[PDB]
DNA sequence: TGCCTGGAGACTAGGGAGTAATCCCCTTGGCGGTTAAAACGC
DNA sequence: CGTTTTAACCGCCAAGGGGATTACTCCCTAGTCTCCAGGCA
């Protein structure tokens, strides 16, 4: 269209099909169905929602407005999954 | 010169399991993190280390879930992961 | 650092800097080398924004709760998100309210007939990129041939566009150029009209873009107008740019009014009498 | 005269004792608890560093990287059981292709 | 200042391998691992002394903590070394 | 005069304050924090007992038994997600028939 | 129902927390240019 | 696998806003002593 490009791509579509494909290949999957993408996108969205909620609560308890790395480390440590190499 | 399906898949599997590179681009994941955090609180800043740790944790969880669903699919005598495979993996792990 | 940034003190520091800098920088003016400048021309025209954006500026319900960039985008033109078109004009075509939502587009509509009748090619310098697409859509609505250039648009197409513009009988009477992407990349010896858009916090690039209309050998009187909104962020930004220019000085809508601003002679007012009559009929 | 030399260790006994005191784990802390904890910590660190050095020498590398740490902690079943719930940044996953996919 | 376990891990590495070095990322990972193990053992000993209605963290509490957290061989050798260290601390 | 009466709760704020003091959770404790925690505990027990009484009335029983508590915990999704890892004596969770194994 | 110890009230003070003053560094938003990566089709 | 497209990565421009600091204040809670009634047998 000459008037405008009219691009409304959603932000959740940032993780594209080859990214999920590489993740599955790293996980050890040979052949991948076509419906895996939406499912893993929803799973990633739920996980990020939980972790971000925990980190936001942690950083709001300290009255700070910047989400630091230690906040995410504590949020991950709360859910029984400790991450190393960041603090 | 074309190859029969399955061999390039195995080559890519070997390449990715050997290396430790990030399989998700930085800017899309950062934008998604910011969008998801907008729902909890507006006008929030983010350090690069924070989004990097988020990306690392997400990739680790995703590859663990992919290994689990691959095992579940192999249990079904198949070589194709399906949505129900991931659902069963999440139900057995308890993080549903 | 302590003494250089001090500008008694400004006079002494400037005297020492001149005494020590004289063998470094050479600078000459057009009025001294060629003396072929028809006028000192420089113009700022003010306008007002629709109440729909004035309410948002006054209330800041979604801003005070990025703010500067969003305010500049709003002041530039509306219809920057799909919801705006979906609410105002679901057809997303060229229709009413396109040239009324902002004073910049009202002025553009009022002055386009004079550019068409007079034949003076107009270069419009822009800071934002979506504003360039909105201007392209508006010019398509106006059935006016124009040139579109932007940063990293194409490697070789820029040369073809420059060659086409340089044609002695080109049928394009306007071109849109990004301010940051200018870089003196075009020798504008066939145009005399310049439009300045978004405020460009860096006066260096503003002056660089404005100076394009004064190439050596130009025969037509140059007219450069900068469109600034009032009672908004744009006015404050213009004031800050003026303060920056004053600091650098120490180291470095009526038909008759628009006619007087744009006409070079009484014959141009005679020609624009028809445009004025058409504007009166439309009003 | 530092207590680490008396005990024969390389870890700071005083720092460990201070962390145990100001950590509010209890109201009193004995004198054998800091040296014992430092001994356990230095033993674990020595084991992990030895495994990482062996892994790096196998990969003809003279500088330990997170990949070598991941390989060393996942090869040994004991540390794998200990740090099973702990992910390591820039460590990836060990290469393991199934027989039905080869 | 900013305290860390960098120099101690570096000395242990140079005492176990004199040729192979260590990077900053691996050093931070080792420091985080040391902190995690320290906090685990400290919490274990604290709750153990609390379950016995005690208030003095001693060698027995840390020994029970490491026997509970470290599984199998990783426990045994450790406590042995621990005992050894304790004995040496009684020597001087 | 008890502070719980002033606050309006039935749980003893003094007992919670003493437990937080002698529990070695911090070096000092506030005055409103024990009341807050007692109110949270009171609300939680109120919800649990309400759901247990509803389950008992549904089963036509005049007393609360561990089966009623288990049913009340497993029925509500909120408490199920909260109490997912804890197991309770007198087990069994949910009578349900599978539509695929008829 | 009877008994008592944990709970409560009054007084003292000091140290951790609240608040003001100061500043720079990390972040946010945007644009240029290049190109390896993403999209569409058989 | 190909061909067409395009958004990600490295590089630059600008700004201002919390995250750091230090200094002063201040009042909340830790005691210590004296009653006493809610909780226990």
Write down the H helix ranges in chain C. Answer: 9-21, 30-33, 51-59, 67-76, 82-88, 103-118, 130-141, 157-165, 203-210, 233-248, 255-262, 266-282
| CA C44 to mean position of chain CA atoms | 9
- Give, in order, the Cα–Cα distances in Å from A57 to each of B31, C238, C245, F39: 20, 41, 46, 21
Are the beta carbons of C214 and C30 closer than 8 angstroms?
A: yes
Q: CATH code at B93?
A: 1.10.20.10
Cα separations in angstroms, C64 against A59, A65, C56, C68, D102: 21, 15, 10, 11, 59
C-alpha distance from residue C254 to each of A37, C272, D74, D96, E71 (Å): 60, 13, 80, 79, 89
Separation CA A14–CA B30 (nearest Å): 9
- Counting every residue written for chain C, the total comes to 283
Cα(F75)–Cα(C147) distance, integer angstroms: 68
**Residue D52: DSSP 8-state:** H
Give the range of the structural domain holding residue B27, as residue numbers without chain letter.
1-96
What distance in Å separates the CA atoms of residue C128 and residue C70, rounded to the nearest whole number?
12
Of D66, D85, D92, which has the smallest distance from its Cβ to A85's Cβ?
D66
| N- to C-terminal Cα separation, chain F | 64
User: The tokens of C115 are what?
Assistant: 């550019």
Nearest to D42 by CA among E18, E77, E68, E45: E77
Under 8 Å CB-to-CB from A10, ≥6 apart: which residues? Answer: none
Q: How far apart are CA B41 and CA A60, in angstroms?
A: 9
Report the C-alpha gap between C31 and C19 in whole angstroms.
25
Task: Record the tokens describing residue F47, joined without a space.
Answer: 């919800």
CA distances C58 to C5, C231, F62, Å, are 37, 10, 64
* Chain-centroid distance, C-alpha C123: 8
Residue B78: is it exposed, middle or buried by C-beta count within 10 angstroms (0-12/13-18/19+)? middle
Distance in angstroms: CA E49, C1' H38: 31
Q: Does residue E38 contact residue E62 with C-beta atoms inside 8 Å?
A: no
Burial of A5 (0-12, 13-18, 19+ CB in 10 A): exposed
Alpha-carbon radius of gyration of chain A: 18
What residues are paired with D87 via a beta bridge? A83
Compute the distance between CA of residue C277 and CA of residue C270 in angstroms, rounded to an integer: 11
Three-state DSSP class for residue C177: strand
Determine the Cα–Cα distance for residues E12 and B79; give it in Å rounded to an integer: 47
CA B87 to mean position of chain CA atoms: 15
Q: How many CB atoms lie within 10 A of CB E78?
A: 22
Resolution (A): 15.0
CATH number, domain A1-86: 1.10.20.10
Is the CB of residue B5 less than 8 Å from the CB of residue B79?
Answer: no
**In chain D, which residues have their Cβ closer than 8 Å to the Cβ of A83?**
86-89
Which residues does chain D have within 8 Å of residue A26's beta carbon, measured at their own beta carbons? 92-93
N-term to C-term CA, chain D: 62
Could you tell me if A49 and A20 are in contact, meaning their C-beta atoms sit under 8 angstroms apart? Answer: no
Number of domains in chain E: 1
Q: In this complex, which of D25, D47, D88 lies closest to E29 when CB atoms are compared?
A: D88
Neighbouring C-alpha atoms within 13 Å toward the C-beta of A51: 30
- What are the two backbone dihedrals, phi and then psi, of residue A2, each rounded to the nearest 5 degrees? -70, -30
Tell the residue number behind the tokens 């390389």, with chain if given.
D10
Cβ neighbour number for residue B25 with a 10 Å cutoff: 14
Task: Compute the distance between CA of residue B34 and CA of residue B26 in angstroms, rounded to an integer.
Answer: 12
CA distance A47 to A76: 11
Which residues pair with residue C22 across a beta bridge? none
For residue C220, the 8-state DSSP code is: S
Chain position carrying tokens 């703010």: C67
* Nucleotide nearest B43 (Cα, C1'): G28
C-beta neighbour count of C227 within 10 angstroms: 22
Chain D nearest-CA residue for A80: D85
Q: For every residue of A21-72, which 3-state class applies, written as one string?
A: HHHHHHHCCCEECCCHHHHHHHHHHHHHHHHHHHHHHHHHHCCCCEECHHHH
Distance CA C240, CA C104 (A): 20
CATH number at residue E82: 1.10.20.10
C195 near C124, Cβ under 8 Å?
yes
CB pairs below 8 Å between A and B: how many?
Answer: 159
Q: In which domain, by residue range, is E2 found?
A: 1-92
**Do A85 and D90 lie within an 8 Å CB cutoff?**
yes
The closest of B58, A43, A74, A56 to A82, measured between CA atoms, is A74
Phi and psi at residue D87, to the nearest 5° = -90, 155
Find all residues with CB under 8 Å of A80, minimum gap 6, and list them.
D85
Residues E19 and D62 sit within 8 Å (Cβ to Cβ): yes
Number of H helices, E strands in chain E: 4, 2
Distance CA(E1)–CA(C115), nearest Å, equals 68
Closest-CA residue to D64 (of E21, C61, E40, C190)? E21
Q: C201 by DSSP, 3-state: which?
A: coil
Rounded CA separation D28/E54 (Å) = 10
Kindly determine whether residue C136 and residue A5, on different chains, have CB atoms separated by under 8 Å. Answer: no
CA pair distance C87, A54, nearest whole angstrom: 37
Nearest CA to C133 out of C95, C75, C176, C71 is that of C176
Among residues B59, B91, B27, the alpha carbon closest in space to that of A24 is found at B59
Distance CA C242, CA C199 (A): 11
The approach used to solve this structure was cryo-EM
For chain F, list the domains and their CATH numbers: 1-102 (1.10.20.10)
First to last CA, chain B: 45
**Please, is C24 exposed, middle or buried when counting C-beta atoms within 10 Å of its C-beta (0-12, 13-18, 19+)?**
exposed
The whole-angstrom distance between C77's CA and the closest CA on chain A is 14
């Amino acid at each position: 269209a000459k008037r405008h490009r009219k691009v409304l791509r959603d932000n959740i579509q940032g993780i594209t099909k080859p990214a999920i494909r590489r993740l599955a290949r790293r996980g050890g999957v040979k052949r991948i169905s076509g419906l895996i993408y939406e499912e893993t996108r929803g799973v990633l969205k739920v996980f990020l929602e939980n972790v971000i909620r925990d980190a936001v609560t942690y950083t709001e308890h300290a009255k700070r407005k910047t989400v630091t790395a230690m906040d995410v480390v504590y949020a991950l440590k709360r859910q029984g999954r400790t991450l190393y190499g960041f603090g | 010169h074309r190859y029969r399906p399955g061999t390039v898949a195995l080559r890519e599997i070997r390449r990715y399991q050997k290396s430790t590179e990030l399989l998700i681009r930085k800017l899309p994941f950062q934008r998604l993190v910011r969008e998801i955090a907008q729902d909890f609180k507006t006008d929030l800043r983010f350090q690069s280390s924070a989004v990097m740790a988020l990306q690392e944790a997400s990739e680790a969880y995703l590859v663990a879930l992919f290994e689990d669903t691959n095992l579940c699919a192999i249990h079904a005598k198949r070589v194709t992961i399906m949505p129900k495979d991931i659902q069963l993996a999440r139900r057995i792990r308890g993080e549903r | 650092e302590d003494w250089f940034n001090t500008p008694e003190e400004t006079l002494l520091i400037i005297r020492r800097l001149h005494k020590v800098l004289r063998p470094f920088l050479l600078r000459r003016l057009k009025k001294e080398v060629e003396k072929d400048l028809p006028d000192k021309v420089e113009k700022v025209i003010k306008c007002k924004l629709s109440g729909l954006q004035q309410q948002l500026y006054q209330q800041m319900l979604k801003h005070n709760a990025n703010k500067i960039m969003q305010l500049r985008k709003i002041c530039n033109h509306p219809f920057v998100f799909d919801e705006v078109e979906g609410v105002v004009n679901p057809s997303r075509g060229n229709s009413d309210l396109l040239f009324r939502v902002a004073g910049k587009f009202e002025l553009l509509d009022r002055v386009l007939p004079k550019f068409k009748a007079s034949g003076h090619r107009v270069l419009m310098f822009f800071q934002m990129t979506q504003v360039m697409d909105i201007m392209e859509d508006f010019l398509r609505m106006k059935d006016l041939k124009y040139m579109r250039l932007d940063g990293s648009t194409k490697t070789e197409e820029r040369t073809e566009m420059l060659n086409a513009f340089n044609a002695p009988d080109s049928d394009y009477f306007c071109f849109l150029l990004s301010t940051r992407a200018g870089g003196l990349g075009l020798n504008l010896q066939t145009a005399d009209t310049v439009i300045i858009f978004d405020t460009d916090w860096n006066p260096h690039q503003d002056l660089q873009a404005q100076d394009r209309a004064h190439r050596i050998g130009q025969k037509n009187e140059v007219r450069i107008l900068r469109l600034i909104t009032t009672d908004s962020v744009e006015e404050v930004i213009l004031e800050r740019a003026m303060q920056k220019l004053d600091i650098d000085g120490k180291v470095i809508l009526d038909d008759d009014e628009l006619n007087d601003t744009l006409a070079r002679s009484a014959d141009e007012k005679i020609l624009f009498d028809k445009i004025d009559k058409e504007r009166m009929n439309q009003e | 005269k530092t207590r680490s030399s008396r005990a024969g260790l390389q870890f700071p006994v005083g720092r460990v004792h201070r962390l145990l005191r100001k950590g509010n784990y209890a109201e009193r802390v004995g004198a054998g608890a800091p040296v014992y904890l430092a001994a356990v910590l230095e033993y674990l660190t020595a084991e992990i560093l030895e495994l990482a050095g062996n892994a790096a020498r196998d990969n003809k590398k003279t500088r330990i990287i997170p990949r070598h740490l991941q390989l060393a902690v996942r090869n040994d079943e004991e540390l794998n059981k200990l740090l099973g719930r702990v992910t390591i940044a820039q460590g990836g996953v060990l290469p393991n292709i199934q027989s039905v996919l080869l | 200042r900013k305290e860390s376990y960098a120099i101690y891990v570096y000395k242990v590495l140079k005492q176990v391998h004199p040729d192979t070095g260590i990077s900053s990322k691996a050093m931070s990972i080792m420091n985080s691992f040391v902190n995690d193990v320290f906090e685990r053992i400290a919490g274990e000993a604290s709750r153990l002394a609390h379950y016995n209605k005690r208030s003095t963290i001693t060698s027995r509490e840390i020994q029970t903590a490491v026997r509970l957290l470290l599984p199998g061989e990783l426990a045994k050798h450790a406590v042995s070394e621990g005992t050894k260290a304790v004995t040496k601390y009684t020597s001087a």
